[PDB]
Write a protein that binds this ligand. Structure first.
Ligand SMILES: *[C@H](C(=O)O)[C@H](O)C(=O)N[C@@H](CC(C)C)C(=O)NCCCCNC(N)=[NH2+]
Length: 249
C-alpha cells in the first residue's frame, strides 16, 4: 500500500452539513409526528452532497456546469408539502472556485457564503437528496451520474461495489486513486445506519485516511473493514460498501 498524506487536509478542505453549507437547501415546512421540531430551518445538505462537494473542491472543477437537474421529493417525505419539485440550474452555473472556500468558520463574506451554499444545493439536488433535518441519498449510483452528466467530470468516473472484487483488487483500486491524487467517494452501512464519506490518504500500513463530512469530528485513519468513527460511541460502516472512483476532470 502506498503512503499518501490526506489530500483534503493538504488543501485545508473541511465541510459539514449545517451553516453556511445549508443556506440554499429547502426550508422545512412540516412537523414529523413525535419530532418537535424543525419547521422554518434549512434541511441538512446530506452526507452524500458533503462528501461529493469536498472532492469537487479538491479539484476546483467545473468552472461551468453542463446540465440542469430536476426531481420531485418522495411523497413519503414528511417535511414538505407534496408535490415538492426541486430544480438546480447547473448548466448556467459559473462556479467561482476562488469564492468557494475550503472551509468556513464565520467571518466569510456574503459572496463566499453564497458560493458554497449554491454548490451544496446543486450537488444535493443532482443526487436526488431526500431533504430533511438529516438528508439521505442512494449515494454512489447518483454521485457517479451527477459528476459526469451535470458537472462534466471525466467519463472515467464510475461506481465500484465491494463484493464485485477480491480484497486485493478492491484495495488496489483505492490505492491507485490515491497515488493519482484523486480522493475517493465511499459509503457503507452498519447497525448505526448508512453514511457517505471521503477516503483521501493511506499510511502504508493498510489504514486509509477518512474525512467523515462532520467538519473534522472523528477524521483519521481506519481499516476498510472497521470504518468505526468515535462519533458512533454502534457497528461501523462495514457492510454494503461502494465507492466512486476515477473522479477527475
Ligand atoms: C448522510 C448523512 O448525513 O449522514 C446519510 O448517512 C445518507 O445519505 N445515508 C444513505 C446511506 C448510504 C450509505 C449513503 C442512506 O441512508 N440512504 C437512504 C436512501 C435515500 C433516503 N430515501 C429516499 N426516499 N430517497
Amino acid at each position: 500500500q502506498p503512503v499518501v498524506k490526506s489530500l483534503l487536509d493538504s488543501k485545508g478542505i473541511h465541510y459539514n452539513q449545517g451553516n453556511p453549507y445549508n443556506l440554499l437547501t429547502p426550508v422545512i415546512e412540516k412537523v414529523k409526528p413525535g419530532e418537535q421540531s424543525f419547521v422554518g430551518q434549512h434541511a441538512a445538505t446530506g452526507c452524500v452532497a458533503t462528501a461529493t462537494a469536498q472532492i469537487m473542491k479538491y479539484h476546483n472543477y467545473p468552472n461551468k456546469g453542463l446540465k440542469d437537474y430536476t426531481y420531485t421529493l418522495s411523497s413519503n417525505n414528511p417535511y414538505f408539502n407534496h408535490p415538492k419539485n426541486l430544480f438546480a440550474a447547473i448548466s448556467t452555473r459559473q462556479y467561482n472556485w476562488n469564492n468557494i472556500l475550503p472551509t468556513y468558520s464565520g467571518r466569510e463574506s456574503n459572496v463566499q457564503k453564497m458560493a458554497i451554499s449554491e454548490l451544496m444545493a446543486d450537488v444535493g439536488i443532482s443526487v436526488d437528496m431526500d431533504y430533511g433535518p438529516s438528508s439521505g441519498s442512494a449515494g454512489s449510483s447518483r454521485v457517479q451520474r451527477a459528476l459526469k452528466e451535470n458537472f462534466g467530470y471525466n467519463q472515467s468516473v464510475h461506481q465500484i461495489n465491494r463484493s464485485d472484487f477480491s480484497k486485493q483488487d478492491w484495495e488496489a483500486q483505492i490505492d491507485k486513486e490515491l497515488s493519482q491524487n484523486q480522493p475517493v467517494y465511499y459509503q457503507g452501512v452498519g447497525k448505526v445506519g448508512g453514511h457517505a464519506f471521503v477516503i483521501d490518504g493511506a499510511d502504508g500500513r493498510n489504514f486509509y485516511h477518512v474525512n467523515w463530512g462532520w467538519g473534522g469530528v472523528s477524521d483519521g485513519f481506519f481499516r476498510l473493514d472497521a470504518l468505526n468513527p468515535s462519533a458512533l460511541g454502534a457497528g461501523g460502516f462495514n457492510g454494503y460498501q461502494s465507492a466512486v472512483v476515477g473522479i477527475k476532470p
